[PDB]
Amino acid sequence: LRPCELQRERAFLKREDYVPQCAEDGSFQTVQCGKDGASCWCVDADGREVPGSRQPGRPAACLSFCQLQKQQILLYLPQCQDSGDYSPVQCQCWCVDAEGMEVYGTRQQGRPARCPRSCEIRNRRLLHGVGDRSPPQCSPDGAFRPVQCKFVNTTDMMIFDLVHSYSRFPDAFVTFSSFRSRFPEVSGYCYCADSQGRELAETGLELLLDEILASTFAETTLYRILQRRFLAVQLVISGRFRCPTKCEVERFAATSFRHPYVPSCHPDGEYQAAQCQQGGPCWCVDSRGQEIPGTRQQ
Amino acid sequence: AAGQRCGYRSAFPPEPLSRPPQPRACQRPQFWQTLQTQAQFQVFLLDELTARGFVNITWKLQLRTQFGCLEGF
Amino acid sequence: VLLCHVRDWRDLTTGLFSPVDLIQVIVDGNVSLPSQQHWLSLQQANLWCLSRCAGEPSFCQLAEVTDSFTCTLYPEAQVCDDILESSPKGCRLILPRRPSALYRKKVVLQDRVKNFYNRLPFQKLTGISIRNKVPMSDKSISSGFFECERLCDMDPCCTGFGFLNVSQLKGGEVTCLTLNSLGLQTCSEEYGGVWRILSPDTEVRTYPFGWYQKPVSPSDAPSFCPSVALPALTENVALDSWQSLALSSVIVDPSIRNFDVAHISVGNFSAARDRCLWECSRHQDCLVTTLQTQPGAVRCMFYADTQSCTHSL
Amino acid sequence: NLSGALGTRGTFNFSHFFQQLGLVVGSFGFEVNLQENQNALQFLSSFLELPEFLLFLQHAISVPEDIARDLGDVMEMVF
Ligand SMILES: *[C@@H]1O[C@H](CO)[C@@H](O[C@@H]2O[C@H](CO)[C@@H](O[C@H]3O[C@H](CO)[C@@H](O)[C@H](O)[C@@H]3O)[C@H](O)[C@H]2NC(C)=O)[C@H](O)[C@H]1NC(C)=O
Ligand SMILES: *[C@@H]1O[C@H](CO)[C@@H](O[C@@H]2O[C@H](CO)[C@@H](O)[C@H](O)[C@H]2NC(C)=O)[C@H](O)[C@H]1NC(C)=O
Ligand SMILES: *[C@@H]1O[C@H](CO)[C@@H](O)[C@H](O)[C@H]1NC(C)=O
Ligand SMILES: *[C@@H]1O[C@H](CO)[C@@H](O)[C@H](O)[C@H]1NC(C)=O
Ligand SMILES: *[C@@H]1O[C@H](CO)[C@@H](O)[C@H](O)[C@H]1NC(C)=O
C-alpha cells in the first residue's frame, strides 16, 4: 500500500486511540489529529510528530513536508514550491517525483526541459521488467487516466501481457472482432485509479469482450469503448458519469476511518469552498484541497 | 570631448568623455515589472513565514511598495 | 611508457576483451579519430595496454597494439551508413592505419539506465547518423527495449536511439539502432493530421517502438564524438527569394490545423533555416515557414495559405 | 440488461448492490437514487442521438482552448 495506510489500518483494527489520517496518495496528512479532535499535531513524511506543535484545535498551517525535510537537513537543499510541495525538478540538477525521492534516471547537469509525470515513469519502469506487463493508461498531460483498463487472461486468472501482445499484433487491436479472433480467452477489466494510479477499492468492473492505426492501446478505439462502457456502468452504480474525484475518495476514507475531519463536496466533485471540522474551526479551501493560508473562523 | 545623448533610453549610466564610449548601449526603455515592500537562519525564517501565506524581509512581486526590476536588467 | 602524446584526446582483463580479426578495418589516412598514442615483450605489453584501457573506460573502446612498439586507444570507430536495417554489415571500421592486434571492448550491460529517454513524437527521421545497428528479434520486446536503452547509455556519443522494425514488407525484424544525430525529424502524429508534407519498410508507431532521444542534457556531446552535420543542400536557396515577415504582421491564432512541424537537431542556425526553407520549397502547397529556436532543436513550422484580412473603409 | 450480458463477476459485489435493490449505500459512501440514475441514463441516451448535438460539437470544438481546456469546460461556460 504505502507507509501510512499500514499504520492507519493497524490503528483502526487495534482500536488504539489515535488513527493517523492520511490523504489519498497515501501520504500522512501534514496536520494529524487525535481520536476526538482534541490535539491536532503535525507530522512529517516519516510519520513522527514535530516537537514544536501539540496545540489543541488545529495548528496554524503547519510547515509542509518538503520544508520540514529541508529544515531537518539544515541541522543539497530542496526547492519547495509555493504550495509547500516539492518543486517538480530539484537541483547535478535532477528532477523528483511528487514524494521527494528522485525519479530514477534523471540526473543531468542542467534543468531538464520537461521531465516525466507519474504515468510516464510507471510505463517506463514497466518496460524495464518490474510489474505486471500491462501499461497504465496515461492522460495526455502525463497523469494517470482516471479509468485504468487492464485485460485479464480468463484461464489461470493471470493478467494478460499487453506490452508484448500489442507490440507483436496491434493489427489485432483494430476492433473488438479482431481481438476476439486473436485472443478469444481474454476478458477486459476496468477500475478507477487515483492520482497515484493505485487501483481504488471495490471499484473494479470486470467487463466482457464477447459481444461488442493507433498505438499505446490508450489511443485504440478498444480502450475508448472499454472506458465509455465503464463510465456508463458507473453512472448507474453512482449516478456520476465519472470516477470518484480526490475529494470523494478522501470523504469516504474519513467517513469509514472515523477521525474528526471529514471533507465536504457536492456532486460536481470539486472541493467545497469551506471545509469544517466537527469540534473545531472552519476554513476555506482551494480546488486542490489545501487550506487557504488563513481563513479560520461576491 | 563629447558626451553621448539618446526616443530611446541609455542603458548605461550617463557620463562625459580617449575613452571608448559604448556604442550598443542605448536601447528600449522597458516598463516596470517588479514591486517590492520591505518590513523589519534565514531559511527557517522564510519557511515558517511562507507557510502563513507570505529582520529584513521583502515580498517582491514580478508583474512602502517601491518599484524595481528583475535582476540582470 | 612515455604516455601523454601531444595530440591525444584529454579531459583476467585480457579475456575481458573481444579480439576481432584485422580484415574488418578500412584503412584511411585522411580520417579524423581521437586516440592516445603509446610507445611500449609482447604479451606483457598487450596486458599493459588493455589494463590502461580499462583504467579510463570513458572513451577507450578500440584498444590496438602493434609491433612495428606502440599501442593506441581509439573510441568506437564504427561509422555506419544511414540505412535502416537489421545488420552492421553496413558498418565498417575506419582507422588511420591497419594495426597488428586490434581488440575492442566487450559491451558490458547494466541493470540501471543512466537517463530517461523521452520518445520523440516524430515518425520520420532523415539525415540520421547511425552508430550501431543491432538485431533484437532474439529477445522479447520489453527485454529487447531494455537492452537497447542500456546500449545507448553505454555509448557516450549516442544522442538518442531507435527501437523499430526494419523490412516490414518482408515481415519486419526488430532492431535497436543508436543515433549520434537525429537529423531533420518530421512526420509527427499530433501535428499536420491534415496537410501532411511527407514508409512501409520501417514502422515506428507501436508502443515500445519510436525514436527515443536521451534528455537534452547540455553536456555538449563530449569532444571526441564524430562531428556530424546534416547532408549539405545540393540546391542553394536564396533567402532574398522569400519575404521575411515582421512578427507584428501575424496573428497567433491557435486551433489552426493546416500546418505541419519539423525539428532539426546540428549545423549553425543558418544551415537549419536553409534546410527548412528548402523543405518547404519542395512543396508548392507550403506557403509560409516559421522557425523558432527550442532548447535542443530548432522547430520549423510550415503553414499553407492562412491570412485573415480585416476590411474597412 | 447488462447483468449477464457484459458486466460480470469482478470486484464490485453486484450481489450487495442489488440486495438493497430489486432482483442505496453506493460505491464510495455514495447515496444512490437508482430511479434518478436510470432517468439520467435515458436522458443521456436520447441526448446523444439528437441532431442538434452534432452541431454543438462542431461549435464546442471551435472555441479556443485557452477559455475552455476541455469540452466539459466549454460546456460549463456555455451554461
Ligand atoms: C514489426 O514486425 C514484427 C516482427 O517481430 C511483428 O511481430 C510479428 O508479427 C506477426 C504477426 O503480424 C507474428 O506472427 C503471428 O501472427 C500470425 C498471424 O497469422 C500467426 O499466423 C503466427 O503463428 C504468429 O502467431 C510474429 O510472431 C511476430 N513476431 C514474432 C517474433 O513472433 C510486428 O507485427 C511488427 N509491428 C508492426 C507495427 O507491424
Ligand atoms: C438485452 O440483452 C440481450 C443480449 O445482449 C439482447 O439480445 C441481443 O439483441 C441484439 C439486438 O439489440 C442482437 O443483435 C443480439 O444478437 C442479441 N444477443 C443475444 C445473445 O440474443 C436483448 O435484445 C436485450 N434486450 C432484452 C429485452 O433482453
Ligand atoms: C491464457 O492462459 C492459457 C492457459 O491455458 C494460455 O495457454 C494462453 O496462452 C493464455 N492466453 C493467451 C492469449 O495466450
Ligand atoms: C553556416 O555554416 C556554413 C558552412 O559552410 C556557411 O556556408 C554559412 O555561411 C554559415 N553561416 C554562419 C552564420 O556562420
Ligand atoms: C460478493 O461477491 C462474493 C464473490 O466475489 C460473493 O461470495 C459474496 O456473496 C458477495 N457478497 C454478498 C453479500 O453476497
Output the DSSP codes for A236-265.
HHHSSSS---HHHHHHHHHHHS--S----B
DSSP string covering A185-225: TEE--EEEB-TT--B-TT--B----S-----TTTSSHHHHH
Kindly list the protein residues whose Cβ atom lies closer than 6 A to any atom of ligand 4: C 268, 270-271
Q: Measured between alpha carbons, how far apart are the two ends of chain C, in Å?
A: 88
- Locate C109 and state its grid cell: 550491460
Residue B8 to residue B2: CA distance in whole angstroms: 19
Residue A4: half-sphere exposure toward Cβ, Cα within 13 Å: 20
Show Cβ contacts of residue C280 under 8 Å, excluding neighbours closer than 6 positions.
C197, C286, C289, C300, C302
Cα→Cα distances B37→A9, A270, B40, B43, Å: 49, 36, 10, 19
Cα→Cα distances C232→A30, A236, C31, C159, C289, Å: 60, 64, 19, 21, 20
User: CB of C206 closer than 6 A to ligand 1?
Assistant: yes
For the beta sheet containing B66-68, the strands, ordered from the edge strand earlier in sequence to the opposite edge, are B57-62, B34-39, B66-68
- Locate C225 and state its grid cell: 564524438
Task: For residue D14, give the ligand 5 atom closest to its CA.
Answer: 1
User: CB of D2 closer than 6 A to ligand 2?
Assistant: no
Q: How many CB atoms lie within 10 A of CB A250?
A: 22
Q: Can you say whether the dihedral through the CA atoms of C214, C220, C225, C230 is positive or negative? A: positive
CA distance A86 to chain C (A): 20
Chains near A, with 3+ CB pairs < 8 A? B, C, D
Residues of D in contact with C255 (CB under 8 A): 62, 64-65
Q: Which helix (H) or strand (E) holds A233?
A: helix A221-238
Q: How many CB atoms lie within 10 A of CB A176?
A: 17
Instruction: Please write down the HEC assignment for all residues of chain C.
Output: CCCCCCCCCCCCHHHHECCCCHHHEEECCCCCCCCCCCCCCCHHHHHHHHHHHHHCCCCCCEEEECCCCCEEEECCCCCECCCCCCCHHHECEEECCCCCCCCCECCCCCCCCCECCECCCEEEEECCCEEECCECCCCCHHHHHHHHHHHHHHCCCCCCEEEEEECCCCCCEEEEEEECCCCEEEEECCCCCCCCCCCCCCECCCCCCECCECCCCCCCCCCCCCCCCCCCCCCCCCHHHCCCCCHHHCCCCCCCCCEEEEEECCCCHHHHHHHHHHHHHHCCCCCEEEEEECCCCEEEEEECCCCCCCCCC
Q: How many CB pairs under 8 A join C and D?
A: 6
B29 with B7: CB under 8 angstroms? no
Write phi, then psi, for B8 (nearest 5 degrees): -85, -170
Which positions 12-71 of D are in contact with A (Cβ < 8 Å)?
12-13, 17, 26-30, 32-34, 36-38, 40-41, 44
Show Cβ contacts of residue C111 under 8 Å, excluding neighbours closer than 6 positions.
none
User: CB of D54 closer than 6 A to ligand 2?
Assistant: no
User: CB of A183 closer than 6 A to ligand 3?
Assistant: yes
CA distance A278 to chain D (A): 19
Show Cβ contacts of residue A238 under 8 Å, excluding neighbours closer than 6 positions.
A244, D26, D27, D28, D30, D32, D37
- Locate A293 and state its grid cell: 493560508
Contact C141 A167 (CB under 8 A): yes
- Bridge partner residues of A23 (DSSP): A27
Q: Tell the residue number behind the cell numbers 469482450, with chain if given.
A: A209
A160 with A187: CB under 8 angstroms? no
* DSSP character at residue A155: G
The SS3 call for residue A274 is strand
Write phi, then psi, for B48 (nearest 5 degrees): -65, -20
- Locate B69 and state its grid cell: 526590476
CA-CA-CA-CA dihedral for C55, C57, C59, C64, to nearest 10: 60
Q: Which of C141, C165, C173 to mutate to test the pocket of ligand 1 (most atoms within 8 A of CB)?
A: C165
The SS3 call for residue A28 is strand
- Locate A259 and state its grid cell: 477521525
CA distance A256 to chain C (A): 40
Q: Which of A25, A58, A65, A24 is nearest to A41 (CA)?
A: A58
Q: Which of C239, C268, C273 to mutate to test the pocket of ligand 4 (most atoms within 8 A of CB)?
A: C268
Chains near C, with 3+ CB pairs < 8 A? A, D
Which among A93, A122, A127, A165 is the top mutation candidate for probing chain C, defined by the most C β-carbons within 10 Å of its own β-carbon?
A: A127
Contact D32 A235 (CB under 8 A): no
Residue A49 to residue A41: CA distance in whole angstroms: 7
Write phi, then psi, for B47 (nearest 5 degrees): -60, -50
* DSSP character at residue A58: -
Question: Which method, experimentally, gave rise to this model?
Answer: cryo-EM
Task: For residue C172, give the ligand 1 atom closest to its CA.
Answer: 2
Question: Regarding beta strands B34-39 and B57-62, do their DSSP bridges make them parallel or antiparallel, or are they unpaired?
Answer: antiparallel
CA distance A68 to chain B (A): 9
Cα→Cα distances D26→A146, A252, B72, C253, Å: 19, 11, 59, 46
